[PDB]
Amino acid sequence: SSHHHHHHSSMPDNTIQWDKDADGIVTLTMDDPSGSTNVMNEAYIESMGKAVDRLVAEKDSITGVVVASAKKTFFAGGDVKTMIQARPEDAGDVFNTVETIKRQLRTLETLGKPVVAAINGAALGGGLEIALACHHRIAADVKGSQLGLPEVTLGLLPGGGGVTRTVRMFGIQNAFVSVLAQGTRFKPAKAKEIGLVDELVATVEELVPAAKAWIKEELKANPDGAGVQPWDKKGYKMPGGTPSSPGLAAILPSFPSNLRKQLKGAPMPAPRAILAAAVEGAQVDFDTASRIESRYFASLVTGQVAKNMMQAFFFDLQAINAGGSRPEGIGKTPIKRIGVLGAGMMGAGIAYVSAKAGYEVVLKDVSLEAAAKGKGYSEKLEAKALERGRTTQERSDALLARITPTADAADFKGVDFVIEAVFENQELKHKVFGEIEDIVEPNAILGSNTSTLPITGLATGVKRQEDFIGIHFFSPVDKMPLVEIIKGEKTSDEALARVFDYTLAIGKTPIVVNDSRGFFTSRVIGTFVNEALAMLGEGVEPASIEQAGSQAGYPAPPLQLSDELNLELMHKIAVATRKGVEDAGGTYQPHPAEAVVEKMIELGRSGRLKGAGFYEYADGKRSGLWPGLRETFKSGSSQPPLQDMIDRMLFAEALETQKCLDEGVLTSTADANIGSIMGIGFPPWTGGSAQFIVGYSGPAGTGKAAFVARARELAAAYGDRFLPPESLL
Amino acid sequence: SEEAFIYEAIRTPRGKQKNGSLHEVKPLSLVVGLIDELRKRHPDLDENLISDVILGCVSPVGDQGGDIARAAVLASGMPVTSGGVQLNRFCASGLEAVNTAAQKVRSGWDDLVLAGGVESMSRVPMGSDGGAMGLDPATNYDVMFVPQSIGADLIATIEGFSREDVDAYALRSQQKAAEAWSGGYFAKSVVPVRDQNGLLILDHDEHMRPDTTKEGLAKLKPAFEGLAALGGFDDVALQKYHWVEKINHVHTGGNSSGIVDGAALVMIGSAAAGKLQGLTPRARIVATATSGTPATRKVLDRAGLTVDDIDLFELNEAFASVVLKFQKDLNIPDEKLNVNGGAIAMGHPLGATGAMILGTMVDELERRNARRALITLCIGGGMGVATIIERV
Amino acid sequence: SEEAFIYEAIRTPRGKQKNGSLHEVKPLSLVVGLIDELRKRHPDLDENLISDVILGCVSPVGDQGGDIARAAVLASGMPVTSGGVQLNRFCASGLEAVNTAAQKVRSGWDDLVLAGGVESMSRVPMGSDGGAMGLDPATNYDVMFVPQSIGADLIATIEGFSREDVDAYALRSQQKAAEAWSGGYFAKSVVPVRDQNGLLILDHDEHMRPDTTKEGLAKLKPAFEGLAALGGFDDVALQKYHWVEKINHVHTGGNSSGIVDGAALVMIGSAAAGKLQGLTPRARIVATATSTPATRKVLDRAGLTVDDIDLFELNEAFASVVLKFQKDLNIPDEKLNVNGGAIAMGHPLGATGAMILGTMVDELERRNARRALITLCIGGGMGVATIIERV
Numbered sequence A: 001s002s003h004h005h006h007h008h009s010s011m012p013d014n015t016i017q018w019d020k021d022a023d024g025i026v027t028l029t030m031d032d033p034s035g036s037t038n039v040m041n042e043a044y045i046e047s048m049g050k051a052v053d054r055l056v057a058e059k060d061s062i063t064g065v066v067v068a069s070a071k072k073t074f075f076a077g078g079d080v081k082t083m084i085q086a087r088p089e090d091a092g093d094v095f096n097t098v099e100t101i102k103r104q105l106r107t108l109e110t111l112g113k114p115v116v117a118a119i120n121g122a123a124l125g126g127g128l129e130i131a132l133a134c135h136h137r138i139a140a141d142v143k144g145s146q147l148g149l150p151e152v153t154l155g156l157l158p159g160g161g162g163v164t165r166t167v168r169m170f171g172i173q174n175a176f177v178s179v180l181a182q183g184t185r186f187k188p189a190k191a192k193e194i195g196l197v198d199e200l201v202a203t204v205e206e207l208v209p210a211a212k213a214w215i216k217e218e219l220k221a222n223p224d225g226a227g228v229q230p231w232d233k234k235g236y237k238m239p240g241g242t243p244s245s246p247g248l249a250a251i252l253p254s255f256p257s258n259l260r261k262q263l264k265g266a267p268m269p270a271p272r273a274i275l276a277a278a279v280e281g282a283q284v285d286f287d288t289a290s291r292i293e294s295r296y297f298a299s300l301v302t303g304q305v306a307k308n309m310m311q312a313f314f315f316d317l318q319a320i321n322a323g324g325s326r327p328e329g330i331g332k333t334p335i336k337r338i339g340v341l342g343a344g345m346m347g348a349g350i351a352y353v354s355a356k357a358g359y360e361v362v363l364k365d366v367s368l369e370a371a372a373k374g375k376g377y378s379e380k381l382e383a384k385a386l387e388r389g390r391t392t393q394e395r396s397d398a399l400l401a402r403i404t405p406t407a408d409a410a411d412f413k414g415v416d417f418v419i420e421a422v423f424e425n426q427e428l429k430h431k432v433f434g435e436i437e438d439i440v441e442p443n444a445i446l447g448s449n450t451s452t453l454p455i456t457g458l459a460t461g462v463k464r465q466e467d468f469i470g471i472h473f474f475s476p477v478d479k480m481p482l483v484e485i486i487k488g489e490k491t492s493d494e495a496l497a498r499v500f501d502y503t504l505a506i507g508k509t510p511i512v513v514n515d516s517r518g519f520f521t522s523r524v525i526g527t528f529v530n531e532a533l534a535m536l537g538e539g540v541e542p543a544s545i546e547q548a549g550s551q552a553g554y555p556a557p558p559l560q561l562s563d564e565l566n567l568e569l570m571h572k573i574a575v576a577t578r579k580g581v582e583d584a585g586g587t588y589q590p591h592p593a594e595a596v597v598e599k600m601i602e603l604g605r606s607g608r609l610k611g612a613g614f615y616e617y618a619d620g621k622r623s624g625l626w627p628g629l630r631e632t633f634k635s636g637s638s639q640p641p642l643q644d645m646i647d648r649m650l651f652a653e654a655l656e657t658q659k660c661l662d663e664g665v666l667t668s669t670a671d672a673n674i675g676s677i678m679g680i681g682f683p684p685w686t687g688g689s690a691q692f693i694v695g696y697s698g699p700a701g702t703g704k705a706a707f708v709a710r711a712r713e714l715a716a717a718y719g720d721r722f723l724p725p726e727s728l729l
Numbered sequence B: 001s002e003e004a005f006i007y008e009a010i011r012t013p014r015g016k017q018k019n020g021s022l023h024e025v026k027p028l029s030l031v032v033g034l035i036d037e038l039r040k041r042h043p044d045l046d047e048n049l050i051s052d053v054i055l056g057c058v059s060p061v062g063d064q065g066g067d068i069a070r071a072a073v074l075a076s077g078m079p080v081t082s083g084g085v086q087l088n089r090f091c092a093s094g095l096e097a098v099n100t101a102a103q104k105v106r107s108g109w110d111d112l113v114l115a116g117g118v119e120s121m122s123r124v125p126m127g128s129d130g131g132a133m134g135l136d137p138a139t140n141y142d143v144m145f146v147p148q149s150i151g152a153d154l155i156a157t158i159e160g161f162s163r164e165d166v167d168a169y170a171l172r173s174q175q176k177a178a179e180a181w182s183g184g185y186f187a188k189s190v191v192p193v194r195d196q197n198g199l200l201i202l203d204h205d206e207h208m209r210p211d212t213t214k215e216g217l218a219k220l221k222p223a224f225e226g227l228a229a230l231g232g233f234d235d236v237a238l239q240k241y242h243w244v245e246k247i248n249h250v251h252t253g254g255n256s257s258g259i260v261d262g263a264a265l266v267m268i269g270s271a272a273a274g275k276l277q278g279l280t281p282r283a284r285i286v287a288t289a290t291s292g293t294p295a296t297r298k299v300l301d302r303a304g305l306t307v308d309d310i311d312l313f314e315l316n317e318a319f320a321s322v323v324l325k326f327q328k329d330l331n332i333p334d335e336k337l338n339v340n341g342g343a344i345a346m347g348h349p350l351g352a353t354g355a356m357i358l359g360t361m362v363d364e365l366e367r368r369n370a371r372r373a374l375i376t377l378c379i380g381g382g383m384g385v386a387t388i389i390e391r392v
Numbered sequence C: 001s002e003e004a005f006i007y008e009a010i011r012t013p014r015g016k017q018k019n020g021s022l023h024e025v026k027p028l029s030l031v032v033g034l035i036d037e038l039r040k041r042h043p044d045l046d047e048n049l050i051s052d053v054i055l056g057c058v059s060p061v062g063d064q065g066g067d068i069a070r071a072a073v074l075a076s077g078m079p080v081t082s083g084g085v086q087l088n089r090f091c092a093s094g095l096e097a098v099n100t101a102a103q104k105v106r107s108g109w110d111d112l113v114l115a116g117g118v119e120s121m122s123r124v125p126m127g128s129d130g131g132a133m134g135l136d137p138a139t140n141y142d143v144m145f146v147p148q149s150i151g152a153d154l155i156a157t158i159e160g161f162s163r164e165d166v167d168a169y170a171l172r173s174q175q176k177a178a179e180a181w182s183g184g185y186f187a188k189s190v191v192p193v194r195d196q197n198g199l200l201i202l203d204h205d206e207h208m209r210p211d212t213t214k215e216g217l218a219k220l221k222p223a224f225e226g227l228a229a230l231g232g233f234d235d236v237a238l239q240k241y242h243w244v245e246k247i248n249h250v251h252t253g254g255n256s257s258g259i260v261d262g263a264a265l266v267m268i269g270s271a272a273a274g275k276l277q278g279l280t281p282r283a284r285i286v287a288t289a290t291s292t293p294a295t296r297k298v299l300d301r302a303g304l305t306v307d308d309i310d311l312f313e314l315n316e317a318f319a320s321v322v323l324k325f326q327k328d329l330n331i332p333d334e335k336l337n338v339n340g341g342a343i344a345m346g347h348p349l350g351a352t353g354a355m356i357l358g359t360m361v362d363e364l365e366r367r368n369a370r371r372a373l374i375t376l377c378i379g380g381g382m383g384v385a386t387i388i389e390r391v
């Protein structure tokens, strides 16, 4: 009933400045002194509580309100340090906190007076929820400003009235699909078109004057409804209809099944909770709907998935984009002209993301014909972006004009950054780099896009071994956000920093990995696909294997991924691992997946590149599982639970990540988590392959101890490769 | 305890969905017309003996709301002490009302009961009552809701029934329904619907297409290949039945039950109530069971019978694949299954189909002079009801 | 043949209508919470041996449509073989579910059955489902449709119950309801409603006004003046009861039943099914009847009279219906609705019959008495009645 969280016997910081003008318009300027961004913390709830108590006390002399900010952004984010420590016994405190917050916005919105949101910069999460409580929203059309409710990307939901208000404004379907389910971030112009914002202005200086102008005109033209939201009038009708209307009730039972289909069965509870609160709230009045939204919010905050997604997509990403794995005392070295060796899907994609970022790119291949078709990869990407309307002809032509196809080694004049993407062969990369190391600038970074071959052995083919470095991209390069920076034994600290800077310049995320056969991504993705092929040899139905991959949360099912990895490459990788052990005198213990791999090579089905893999391919498209697959491996003779298939894949990658951290391959769990999600596709609800252990949740318990207990269950039934390393015991 | 006997079992004709003859007739008028027919056949029946009226109704809303069983008691001039309860148990409602009537007599605390069902799907379509699930995405999400049409398609993919196999059964149902109508088999139990002036509205099951050919069925397009990914129900089905790769959509409007209007009434009572009113039993309720394919075995395990003891099997033709699986799983001889056609040809009025196909078996038992019939309903999934009757 | 016993009888508290604590809870969740309570009290129960779930529901539309009993079986994770059927017999639906479950036990073709009712009247008001005898003018005209409230005022007119007489009973129902709550009578049967976080939503019957006086009761204005002159229901009533001149309207919101939300569940099974599952019977279903002249029908069927009954439980739809029933069978004042009734605690249509049945199961045990009689929708019409024995 109060706007303050406590009502019994320290004190927070005041973050809102009170200015009332002559006409009676009060301006609320948010400015938290303890940060450059206004956030949803205790200092704000106390400050906004005082201002709301004061608007009610001085209601007889106040004629309108303007909500403004003094930072570069409007209001974005919350106190994640506090939310992540919310345990099940805290549900009472979480529920009461968001009820107080929303009661503050509820009083401001039913004040009987016009309230205008002067959105100067970015309003995200609680920021847009504050602006949604106002009656009119004007935004400054500026570079970098974003408006949206991205709570779902952290395993949460818009708990400060975002779900109830967007549903009341746009209806159930348009609110869920366009704003809530994916946490889409909008540009000020896009927000005006979808109704999130009403007017646009050119600069921030005009905002408060434009708001006060709107207040003055609103009190003159339409006084009866001044300060009244559409849903607080007698004749309100929800767009698209209430749940009990005939048009919406015909498709309503199909909303959860459509959501069950986008997630592919993955256990991510936030979108489910959003759809529930949206629909359940559209059945009652606003204040009851708002309270239902609090209860669904509290259950998500006290859960495990939210802690995993907050740990990964907030804290872990903070440390990476702050230079966590970058060397300390290194300066900036601008890049003039990039050289790419190889016009395959990798080199062409590398040239595209570099050109899109504004860099001059020289694309070299063994023939002009092949080089010209490599630049055609960017033509087809710019064609789609023109038809869809994401880029202009001016922007698109300048992008394509920074790519220069060539077949001549002498066209590498003045190149100070090499990125080789040729066939993965030890003595080919020696020949390719030998013809380039003397033509390029004497300070040129010499990068290699290698998946498994160690960089230390590759660097012996150039004279400046200090500037040879691994730069591992992921297909397709325009969509995959991670770059795996691999440090050889002779690679200097400056080369790491210069490639680190290049990764952020092209808009990707870098992890830093020490040199080892398989690096991190290729070694961990192999354990995932080798588990699935092991199940196929054991006799599990192939359809169950693929469902097990999707319901676990992976972006691509494992048998589909294997065809794209090519079984020929997978086989000679196992031959290299077998040689690296038999050369050290030891005896090689093969993976049971190697028998399946050799059988598909034996039957002439080595993957997608050869037109036949576990799937069939016709007209350049995947066309169903190969019918003869069930007879080759006697499918159906082994029917384990789906949760066991799911765990075998998740645990194989989690254990292998742990062994990568023990051997010094990775240097931090932040690199392991983000590198597993953005690199190989480990499910986002886990917070990463390392967070999967500390955050494990199963029917037997929670945490590292429960993970160890489950891995021992898997080991007793499926093989000793699931026995946890000694570093977990 | 006390044996429950069937004394009468009548039903309206089934009127089709589009341009149907029964679209103007309130569903309360469908029941009342059957109540008046029972008076015409037993004008000296003491209606104070009747102690309850149990009507099944899947969509008790609108014209079918407010306890339609009680409206019928009052609108038809039955005594106020004759009660009136509506129930809903999906496709099984018409048979659950009969079994509940039989159980109320077996308990000894009731003597004579009217049971049946009514459904005007052309005026109150399926789903009009809302749903404790569709208005609740959380429940819908967790229980993995799948409409029965997709599940029938999934049964055909798993059991191996092709598009020709389900069409072969649809052709069989239309042929046997036409022979039963031409043969006069339904002359004494299908009560023509008349208006307030006594003028004929409907006298036959107008959903029938007795000129059906194998080619006409092959030209129909799959009916649920447009609701599959439109709601994502094919993917939701395959997340549960994960060993299946692709659902074969073989069910069309020609091998699925028809959306029709109709009602049915059965008179259940004890032996003492029969002798006292001057009524001769037509059949006896031997056993009932509720389970879910396993309700058929549970009712046989209760009467001490096997498949070979039953002379007639009557399973609702909601979908062809459901009936075909039931046939293959219990090795049902083709000459014992839905001998007078089924819902594919004549229609499936949800709340009333149970009492409609029970009365179909009482008449066919007497026409053939056979002993036992087995009637089962809503078999698909977890629910399902079965009943065994013996000719008296 | 078999004997129907009661093994458990639980119910949610009853949340009021305006600013009600259960308004945010879906009715499906009200039932599931009571199912999970039975699990908490008998975790050893083989739910495969539960063969049906029968729920009373008078307005089965919207939140309460689509066979809400089947939804309860699915949403609570009960076996898919546990059935699920909804029924409607107006005010008696809850007790009709219990009696039907008892008859299904006696017939020998059912072993263990869950029965009860649910009704969220603040989310789905009565009449929301439609109905012919209200929305079909030909039938309505012929049967002389009159709401049950006008009929209650008519009863007070004929029988001669003054406004002072109905309000005096309304006070006793509030006093007995307060005494039962303060004495812990409801501690083990009223299961508080919690949300998905374990937070408390409601733990008491909100509709109660334990500080009621007869001066405040007299201040209330009659509740069905505007309805009787909206559609002329007084005139329609007096056309059939043509010997009475004017209806005396003595019923208000303080002497009629409250409009509330709630649910109740009763576990009914055979003697053999109880031994296997380690269940102790708490009561026995002696007889059930349907028709004042439904109470007699169940007395003759059980070979009992009024003197043999220890406690009488009549739903307090309106005060005059209970007073008339008291003078027709000479029911002593200390045997009639001993722990309050619907005037104080509310009348959640489809669930009331199953609620007041559980109230007598506990008062028999607490008083160490033999028999009790429960009846609803009474006064000729379409009434139901049941006699239970304590075991």
Ligand SMILES: N#Cc1ccc(S(=O)(=O)O)cc1
Residues within 6 Å of the ligand: A082, A083, A085, A086, A087, A090, A093, A094, A097, A098, A301
């Ligand atoms: N919003 C919010 C919120 C309030 C309290 C807590 S805590 O559990 O008390 O640390 C966590 C989150």
Ligand SMILES: N#Cc1ccc(S(=O)(=O)O)cc1
Residues within 6 Å of the ligand: A076, A077, A078, A079, A080, A083, A124, A125, A126, A149, A150, A151, A152, A154
């Ligand atoms: N707690 C919390 C919280 C953090 C970030 C965001 S946002 O999605 O980045 O605007 C929203 C809520």
Ligand SMILES: N#Cc1ccc(S(=O)(=O)O)cc1
Residues within 6 Å of the ligand: A367, A368, A369, A370
């Ligand atoms: N033989 C051959 C041949 C191959 C490539 C080219 S091209 O110059 O790269 O287009 C020209 C001739």
Ligand SMILES: N#Cc1ccc(S(=O)(=O)O)cc1
Residues within 6 Å of the ligand: A344, A346, A347, A420, A421, A422, A423, A424, A449, A450
């Ligand atoms: N970088 C890179 C790269 C280039 C060619 C091939 S392929 O073996 O020719 O398909 C694989 C990787």
